[PDB]
Amino acid sequence: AMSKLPENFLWGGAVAAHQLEGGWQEGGKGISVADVMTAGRHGVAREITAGVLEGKYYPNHEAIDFYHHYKEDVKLFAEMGFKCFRTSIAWTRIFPKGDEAEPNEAGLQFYDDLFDECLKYGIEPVVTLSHFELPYHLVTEYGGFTNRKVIDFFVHFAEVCFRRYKDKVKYWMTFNEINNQANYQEDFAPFTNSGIVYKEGDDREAIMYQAAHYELVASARAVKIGHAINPNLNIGCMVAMCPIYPATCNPKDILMAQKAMQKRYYFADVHVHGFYPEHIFKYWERKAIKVDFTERDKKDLFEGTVDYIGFSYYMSFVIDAHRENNPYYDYLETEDLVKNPYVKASDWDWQIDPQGLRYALNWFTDMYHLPLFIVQNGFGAIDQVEADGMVHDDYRIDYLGAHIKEMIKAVDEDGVELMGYTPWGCIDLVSAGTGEMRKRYGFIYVDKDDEGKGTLKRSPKLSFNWYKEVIASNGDDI
Amino acid sequence: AMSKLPENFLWGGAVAAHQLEGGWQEGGKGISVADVMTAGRHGVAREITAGVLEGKYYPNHEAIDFYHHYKEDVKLFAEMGFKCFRTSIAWTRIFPKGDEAEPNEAGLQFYDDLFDECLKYGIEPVVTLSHFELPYHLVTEYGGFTNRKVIDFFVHFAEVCFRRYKDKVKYWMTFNEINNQANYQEDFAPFTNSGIVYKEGDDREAIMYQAAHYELVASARAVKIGHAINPNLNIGCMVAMCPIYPATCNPKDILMAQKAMQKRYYFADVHVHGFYPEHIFKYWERKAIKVDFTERDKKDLFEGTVDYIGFSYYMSFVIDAHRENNPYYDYLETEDLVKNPYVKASDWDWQIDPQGLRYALNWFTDMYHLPLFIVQNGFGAIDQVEADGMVHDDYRIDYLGAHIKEMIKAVDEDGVELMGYTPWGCIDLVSAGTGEMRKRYGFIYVDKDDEGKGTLKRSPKLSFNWYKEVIASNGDDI
Numbered sequence A, B: 001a002m003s004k005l006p007e008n009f010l011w012g013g014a015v016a017a018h019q020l021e022g023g024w025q026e027g028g029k030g031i032s033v034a035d036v037m038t039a040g041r042h043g044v045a046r047e048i049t050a051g052v053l054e055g056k057y058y059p060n061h062e063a064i065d066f067y068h069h070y071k072e073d074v075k076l077f078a079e080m081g082f083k084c085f086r087t088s089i090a091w092t093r094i095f096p097k098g099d100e101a102e103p104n105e106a107g108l109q110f111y112d113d114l115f116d117e118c119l120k121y122g123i124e125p126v127v128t129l130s131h132f133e134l135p136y137h138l139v140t141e142y143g144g145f146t147n148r149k150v151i152d153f154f155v156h157f158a159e160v161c162f163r164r165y166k167d168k169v170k171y172w173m174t175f176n177e178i179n180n181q182a183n184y185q186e187d188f189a190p191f192t193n194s195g196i197v198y199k200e201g202d203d204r205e206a207i208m209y210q211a212a213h214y215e216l217v218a219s220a221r222a223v224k225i226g227h228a229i230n231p232n233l234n235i236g237c238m239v240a241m242c243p244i245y246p247a248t249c250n251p252k253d254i255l256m257a258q259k260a261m262q263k264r265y266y267f268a269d270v271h272v273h274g275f276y277p278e279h280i281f282k283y284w285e286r287k288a289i290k291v292d293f294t295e296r297d298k299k300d301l302f303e304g305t306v307d308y309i310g311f312s313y314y315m316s317f318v319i320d321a322h323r324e325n326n327p328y329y330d331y332l333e334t335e336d337l338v339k340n341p342y343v344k345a346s347d348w349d350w351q352i353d354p355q356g357l358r359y360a361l362n363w364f365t366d367m368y369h370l371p372l373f374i375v376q377n378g379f380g381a382i383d384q385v386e387a388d389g390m391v392h393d394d395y396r397i398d399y400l401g402a403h404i405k406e407m408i409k410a411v412d413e414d415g416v417e418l419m420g421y422t423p424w425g426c427i428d429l430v431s432a433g434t435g436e437m438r439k440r441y442g443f444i445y446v447d448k449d450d451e452g453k454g455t456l457k458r459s460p461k462l463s464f465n466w467y468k469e470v471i472a473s474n475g476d477d478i
């Protein structure tokens, strides 16, 4: 009876290798998909270049040089009182090309040192095996996850990590936001989830269902392998959770929303229940989508269901039936969505809806009854440095706080099993969508701009002590 | 490849004993809760009288005398080509008082004859064990299902039926629309689901959670007993399914709807998963609701989950956050609901929303992945007899047809497991809500009015042959 959350609640901070590490060549790090994505801005898309071209600016190359400053940054984290720290093991640091019979020792010891650093301070590593950073070689030589071969490659990588870190890392996830690729219209998700370069004329949708299937099977094989290595390992899936509201109580909107939820979260059904929902098979029929799906796959999936559901939450969506010629209620994320009139939004147009997080949490609970883990939540905004040399980011404090409250009501009032809560980008890093430094998520300001300038000096923002106090009060004082 | 539904799809018609049988005293039939409910009209409520008073009119007493005319009526059913016929075994015909050590033979042979009649014609009986007709004695002497004793009484009744009809009836359900009592404000549901007479000052909500719990346990014990008697028996639950839409995409409405769905369908969670959702326990805490819930209950529930979900569908609801002083998002079915602007409605104000049936079907599938059975759907309307001596009820044909189409899209496009489809009140009978004859559901017109007059002659309506043809085309020709 100290607070409303469990005593061992896992407060932390989350990042991803390719977004902060830098030293993209150190250790012999192979070149990854992140490494061939140039910078952009709100509105302007990143360019996926055919290799590393001259004249282009690749922000992930240096990022914030975490690769060298990790001892300092971790000290900062422990100073806020992190109980956990989430990041990914850069696939490119362990298998630079991807097809190697042997893992890279420089890559492994590096993470041995990183986890060691966390553990010194009482911080529990939370590790994501694939986070938008697969070997670019795998893309050009195999076509990414459209090749069944790439499954073994991933499982190979996963077992190595599992065996190496079996006594260090308790919490794992396989594929970051695996369901992002439900949007197959734009190139981003297909490229970052699955290493898909689309060629002109391709059946984009179809190519992505097949890749997702391979990854689902790969995830399931890893889960089984990881448990055989250490049965205590908690291995969860990871889905991006953008709840999808019906615009109105018009039955057509209702059906749009339900159908879109099914297409956006069938991935979770497979991770959790171990089989595909029928509405996916029916749909593949209607669209003559052919999937290479063996009896063996079926067995693997059913056998490799997850321990818990990790997920990100930043916003919610609205949908309606406005689009013509759509009698099957297909879901086009680039077309069917509309703005929610009842909510504010960030300068990147990301809608602010704390209550949605509560909705999300109840949803997963009712659907699956598994432990849940908010492993990404946060607010991207422009920071100005006040005269006292500190960013007074109360806007960021507001966002996170409102979300923390809703998450607490979910545990306290609603009874969801929640493992912990991990704010995204706890230190300023390179954004995923645009490759911007100026879209900052951090409790820690890093002096680097989008033209690549700055000392890379770390300074705490206002929200640093605020959050330090949230952790200390285990949620009582927000 | 004959049609869109499975060859063995179970088309039928549904009724309930107390609503058509009559002969409420024949066989020594004990007096039931139906038997003490007087008539009413749209707007005017039925009176639950303390016993059978003089001067009051009890329509269920005679109803349509099905008890005598069943041989004729079944012939009518077979003429439409029913593959199944659904009704309830009148608890009062088997255990008139309820507490007897021995079942009533007159009551049993009666149903032996009724099922025999169906089977002659190739019709499969579908039986509901409790449908708003428990012994009134059980109410006055035990307080209905607020007494833990009444569990055994029900299980006793269920095993008798199971053993008697083990080779005759393949499809069973335990408690009709068990979740109706989520509305504990008005007296109807608590009285008809659970035999609850509220006394002034009572904690209505609390008294109903306890009764529901007893019934849930009773259902679970019966399921287990029935399987031990014949492992082939399909024993499903039965829930009233009124989908609950958010009025708008305002997050508050969203949360209202989700919370209301949880309170209205936790019954299904218990039937299906075998345990209570945590949000129910949390809620009982907040409201200091105490439930007598033993370790043994827990074991029974987990052990007595259902084979399939039977359900009724007539309409959908809309909800919003308008009501003040409601920061916990409690659900009051008498207060929180609003009209759906995008749909028409019957003269009893029941909203017409076929698409909702599709929503319903997808909902259950996604939540539970069990076979489903639409065992009640229909349209109550005033019938006028045309000059040719037939009711031209195209309004009724319209309603059912639209619903059949949506149900077919669900199977065909969405891939739900649906066992069959059973229109409600396939022959005109006494309505549940108001006790009216004039609120007609039938393919078969019965000449009896609400003042009790008429020859009780049966005549087919326009919709008779229409439906006969739906069955023959197995859904192709609607």
Ligand SMILES: O=P(O)(O)OC[C@H]1O[C@@H](Oc2ccccc2CO)[C@H](O)[C@@H](O)[C@@H]1O
Pocket (backbone or CB within 6 Å): A016, A019, A132, A176, A177, A240, A241, A242, A312, A314, A376, A380, A424, A430, A431, A432, A433, A434, A439
């Ligand atoms: O603001 P950024 O940097 O564009 O995103 C934030 C973070 O959210 C995660 O998910 C997203 C990434 C991009 C767009 C949307 C989402 C949310 O569904 C992503 O997995 C992270 O890698 C990313 O950095």
Ligand SMILES: O=P(O)(O)OC[C@H]1O[C@@H](Oc2ccccc2CO)[C@H](O)[C@@H](O)[C@@H]1O
Pocket (backbone or CB within 6 Å): B016, B019, B132, B176, B177, B240, B241, B242, B312, B314, B376, B380, B424, B430, B431, B432, B433, B434, B439
């Ligand atoms: O039109 P009536 O006769 O008032 O109802 C129709 C039928 O629907 C069933 O459910 C209902 C009964 C009454 C009100 C609403 C519902 C639907 O949720 C009931 O279980 C039947 O016994 C009943 O006859």
